Design an enzyme around this catalytic site. Structure first.
Site, PDB file in Angstrom:
ATOM      1  N   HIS A 164       0.906   5.115  -2.851  1.00 22.45           N
ATOM      2  CA  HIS A 164       1.169   6.455  -2.353  1.00 22.45           C
ATOM      3  C   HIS A 164       2.550   7.043  -2.663  1.00 22.45           C
ATOM      4  CE1 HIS A 164      -2.495   7.031   0.118  1.00 22.45           C
ATOM      5  NE2 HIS A 164      -2.516   5.710   0.063  1.00 22.45           N
ATOM      6  N   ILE A 195      -6.938   8.491  -0.879  1.00 24.66           N
ATOM      7  CA  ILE A 195      -7.116   8.269   0.548  1.00 24.66           C
ATOM      8  C   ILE A 195      -6.144   7.159   0.954  1.00 24.66           C
ATOM      9  CG2 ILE A 195      -8.955   6.543   0.223  1.00 24.66           C
ATOM     10  CD1 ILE A 195      -8.445   9.142   3.081  1.00 24.66           C
ATOM     11  N   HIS A 223       0.793  -1.209   0.000  1.00 22.70           N
ATOM     12  CA  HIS A 223       0.000   0.000   0.000  1.00 22.70           C
ATOM     13  C   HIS A 223       0.837   1.277   0.000  1.00 22.70           C
ATOM     14  CE1 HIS A 223      -3.527   2.403   2.022  1.00 22.70           C
ATOM     15  NE2 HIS A 223      -3.333   2.751   0.760  1.00 22.70           N
ATOM     16  N   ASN A 281      -6.401  -1.013  -0.936  1.00 25.43           N
ATOM     17  CA  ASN A 281      -6.871  -0.029   0.041  1.00 25.43           C
ATOM     18  C   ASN A 281      -8.276  -0.244   0.613  1.00 25.43           C
ATOM     19  OD1 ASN A 281      -6.488   2.861   1.258  1.00 25.43           O
ATOM     20  ND2 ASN A 281      -8.543   2.880   0.371  1.00 25.43           N
ATOM     21  N   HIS A 290      -4.245   0.540  -6.309  1.00 25.65           N
ATOM     22  CA  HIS A 290      -4.495   1.173  -5.022  1.00 25.65           C
ATOM     23  C   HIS A 290      -5.873   0.775  -4.478  1.00 25.65           C
ATOM     24  CE1 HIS A 290      -6.037   4.442  -2.398  1.00 25.65           C
ATOM     25  NE2 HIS A 290      -4.884   4.175  -1.808  1.00 25.65           N
TER      26      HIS A 290
HETATM   27 FE   LIG Z   1      -4.391   4.644   0.256  1.00 22.11          FE
END
Ligand SMILES: [Fe+3]
Length: 817
Positions: free
Chosen positions: A482, A817, A477, A672, A668
């Site tokens: 990110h 997010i 992740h 996520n 993602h």
């Molecule tokens: Fe995330």
């Protein structure tokens, strides 16, 4: 001769004061140039009045009428300057000129005195550099130069400067030497993707570490405002670490709630009757935006978490070997399992340092449903979740911590004839070096359903999942989505003009990424932040991701490449996607290939609209500068690697864009949005382990026999960090109601090119088509084993669409997010 125009904007607080001489606009010609080749500029024209006509205008938006002194002699306008004379900034949505030219702005415009140069916006036309109208060329390059800045200075809220810097802002050495952290990025010891430059300056005690700041800057338009405060999910992390965590901690320090869970029912209670906490603790939480949406409350003493999807049908199914293995292919972290082609499994680590690394798992001890080891290997039915080499280098330092103990684990899985995976052995390894003070040794644990043996096997699964949750949070992740994506966001704004076709193709996939990342550097991955205080490695967490990054390969992020590299698929031209899965009902991979193919078709149809031949790619000055910087600066610590694409052909351009869009959207989403759905029950996804297996003849061993649930709970994440961790994953698993999903754009006029718009519409239709297909898969009784499992949880993480909330489905365009 005047040009009728309509300006749409949103006042900061989400009208007559905008009139008078408050706001001025100046049209810029795209065809008529001054004595320098620069498009002629009209006179300052102020807003004339409020337009309250078209019902088509919501979102706290307001329209203003305006007329420009523009003769046909001034050519055709293609851009405009705007000056805000008001004290407060407003959000400029768009400008529309009748008889139609459209400008999509979506940008905050601060008071004119704060800007070094006047804000400039271009019409929605798309141009590779060599196609830029002559009168806009210099304006195009000057705006990019403005976006790059000069690499110095402390960035301010209204700045729109994009630049790079290392991760030297996580430690807080000025507060304590114990919060000092190594700089990640810029060294061979700690390579790491770069992040957005903030320029706050050095700490007092360390010139290499950036001082603390109340606000971690991101270029202004990267900081997304929201009409509804509940949609500002990214601020929740800050509130959780800075306000809620201390509130929880006081409840425990005051002994107002038991310090530890004593039974599994104590954990289930959290989403049933709830947990009772001090009034002042409830009062501290209940009024915070975002945080208040995380728990139901009686307003006095009760906090109730939502029932995690994983227990919605069976609260005990997570304990089954079937679910443990199924989550490796359809769970929160479905992308680490590998094919195992030899036995026993091997290690590349130095035995001189860690002791003999040969595996202790014997083939004759395994239940392969009647298959011999050679048969299992040859039929490609043997797999493994291998954390042995990844964790071994960190086990000694982690185990030296007061409340942390882990093993470097390896799980062997067998693909049964019925198509489901079954776990057949778990190896729990510890490093050994002459002189070690610890007498604990490595051991192999086999499946067991009864007696103390079943408890030892359940604990072995917990050690494995602690390794997996740590690897998932930090690598699958954080690092792979990110962190790896930020360098590309920065390069894109620094080198591709808003007019550029690739800018338009990629930027929707960057929405909110720099913003959530900056908030993460401040409260999630900082010294003593959420991850360090909730996951096993503690202060070693983020640096572990740097060690893993040494092996990060851009081209291996492509889904087919990943599947092949992990030995879970083989190249096969006779197949639709060019790869044959070795686990046919591998939900993440099967659904993933469908999304991957749709994005590929979209990119392959878009690129040709702007580049006819390979030479057109080599000759795009902006595109070449973009890629050269993304690699040499953004992911600069890996600039010496041979696998980077060159970007001198249409093929390479398509490849690079396809991988970028894949990472930002589907990859993602898949790693996520299942965090709370699967990890909301701490027993199913423990974030930490606090002790190794007990030795026979000790009270701890007797406890495994007499109170197995307590033995388990004392081993995994403690109750306090569990409350903090559940809260953060609940936030991160939530879809804001203003999200923009794959197949969507925030404006129907992002480009005036009908060809590009038609191609995009086909892409969205294809995603809808794919969703119906995935629904049929989940409803197919023959796929129940892996797509639903004993937890009866349909795999919907790669369904393209979703309504707001904690839905376990929906693919956003970006890492939002
Ligand atoms: Fe995330």
């Amino acid at each position: 001769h005047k040009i009728k125009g309509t300006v749409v904007l949103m006042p900061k607080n989400e009208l007559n004061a905008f009139l008078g001489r408050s706001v001025s606009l100046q049209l810029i010609s795209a065809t008529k140039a001054d004595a320098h080749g620069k498009g002629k500029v009209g006179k300052d024209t102020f807003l004339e009045g409020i337009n309250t006509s078209l019902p088509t205008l919501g979102a706290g938006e307001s329209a203003f009428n305006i007329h420009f002194e523009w003769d046909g002699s001034m050519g055709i306008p293609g851009a405009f300057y705007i000056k805000n004379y008001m004290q407060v900034e407003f959000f400029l949505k768009s400008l529309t000129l009748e008889a139609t030219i459209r400008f999509v702005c979506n940008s905050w415009v601060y008071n004119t005195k704060l800007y070094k140069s006047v804000r400039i916006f271009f019409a929605n036309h798309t141009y590779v550099p060599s196609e830029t109208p002559a009168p806009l060329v210099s304006y195009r390059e000057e705006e990019l130069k403005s976006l790059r800045g000069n690499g110095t200075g402390e960035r301010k809220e209204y700045d729109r400067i994009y630049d790079y810097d290392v991760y030297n802002d996580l430690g807080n050495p000025d507060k304590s030497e114990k919060l000092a952290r190594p700089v990640l990025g810029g060294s061979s010891t700690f390579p790491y993707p770069r992040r957005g430059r903030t320029g706050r300056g050095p700490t007092v005690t360390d010139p290499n570490t950036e001082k603390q700041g109340e606000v971690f800057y991101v270029p202004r338009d990267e900081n997304l405002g929201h009409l509804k405060s509940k949609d500002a999910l990214e601020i929740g992390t800050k509130s959780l670490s800075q306000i809620v965590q201390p509130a929880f901690e006081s409840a425990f320090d005051l002994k107002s709630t038991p310090i530890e869970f004593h039974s599994f029912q104590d954990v289930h209670d959290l989403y049933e009757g709830g947990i009772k906490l001090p009034r002042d603790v409830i009062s501290t939480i209940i009024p915070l935006p975002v945080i208040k949406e995380l728990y139901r409350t009686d307003g006095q003493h009760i906090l109730k978490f939502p029932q995690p999807h994983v227990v919605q049908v069976s609260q005990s199914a997570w304990m089954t070997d079937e679910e443990f293995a199924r989550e490796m292919i359809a769970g929160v972290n479905p992308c680490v399992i590998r094919g195992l082609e030899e036995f026993p499994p091997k290690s590349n680590l130095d035995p001189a340092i860690y002791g003999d690394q040969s595996s202790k798992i014997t083939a004759d001890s395994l239940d392969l449903d009647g298959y011999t080891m050679d048969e299992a290997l040859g039929s490609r039915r043997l797999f493994m979740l291998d954390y042995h080499d990844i964790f071994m280098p960190y086990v000694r330092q982690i185990n030296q911590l007061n409340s942390a103990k882990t093993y470097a684990t390896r799980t062997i899985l067998f693909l049964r004839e019925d198509g489901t995976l079954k776990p057949v052995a778990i190896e729990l390894s510890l490093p050994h070096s002459a002189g070690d003070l610890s007498a604990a040794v490595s051991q192999v644990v086999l499946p067991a359903k009864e007696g103390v043996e079943s408890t030892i096997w359940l604990l072995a699964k917990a050690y494995v999942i602690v390794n997996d949750s740590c690897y998932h949070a930090l690598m699958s992740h954080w690092l792979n989505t990110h962190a790896a994506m930020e360098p590309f966001v920065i390069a894109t704004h620094r080198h591709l003009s808003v007019l550029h076709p690739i800018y338009k193709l990629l930027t929707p996939h960057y929405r909110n990424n720099m913003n959530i990342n900056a908030l993460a550097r401040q409260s999630l991955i900082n010294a003593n932040g959420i991850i360090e205080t909730t996951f096993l490695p503690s202060k070693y967490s983020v640096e572990m991701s740097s060690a893993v990054y040494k092996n990060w390969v851009f081209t291996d992020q492509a889904l087919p490449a990943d599947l092949i590299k992990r030995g879970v698929a083989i190249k096969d031209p006779s197949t639709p996607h060019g790869v044959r899965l070795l686990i046919e009902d591998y939900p993440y991979a099967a659904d993933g290939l469908e999304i991957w193919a749709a994005i590929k078709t979209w990119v392959q149809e878009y690129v040709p609209l702007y580049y006819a031949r390979d030479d057109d790619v080599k000759n795009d000055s902006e595109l070449q500068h973009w890629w050269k910087e993304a690699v040499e600066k953004g992911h600069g610590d890996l600039k010496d690697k041979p696998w980077w694409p060159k970007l001198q052909t249409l093929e390479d351009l398509v490849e690079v864009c396809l991988i970028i869009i894949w990472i930002a959207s589907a990859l993602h989403a898949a790693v996520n949005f299942g965090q709370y759905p699967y990890g909301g029950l701490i027993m199913n996804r423990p974030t930490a382990s606090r002790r190794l297996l007990p030795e026979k003849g000790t009270p701890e061993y007797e406890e495994m026999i007499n109170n197995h649930e307590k033995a388990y709970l004392r081993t995994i994440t403690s109750k306090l960090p569990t409350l903090i961790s559940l809260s953060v994953i609940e936030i991160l698993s939530t879809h804001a109601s203003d999200e923009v999903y794959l197949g969507q754009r925030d404006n129907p006029h992002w480009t005036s090119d009908s060809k590009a718009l038609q191609a995009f519409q086909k892409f969205g239709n294809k995603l809808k088509e794919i969703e119906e297909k995935l629904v049929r898969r989940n409803n197919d009784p023959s796929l129940q084993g892996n797509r639903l499992g004993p937890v009866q949880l349909p795999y919907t993480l790669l369904y393209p669409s979703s309504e707001e909330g904690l839905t376990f489905r929906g693919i956003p365009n970006s890492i939002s997010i």
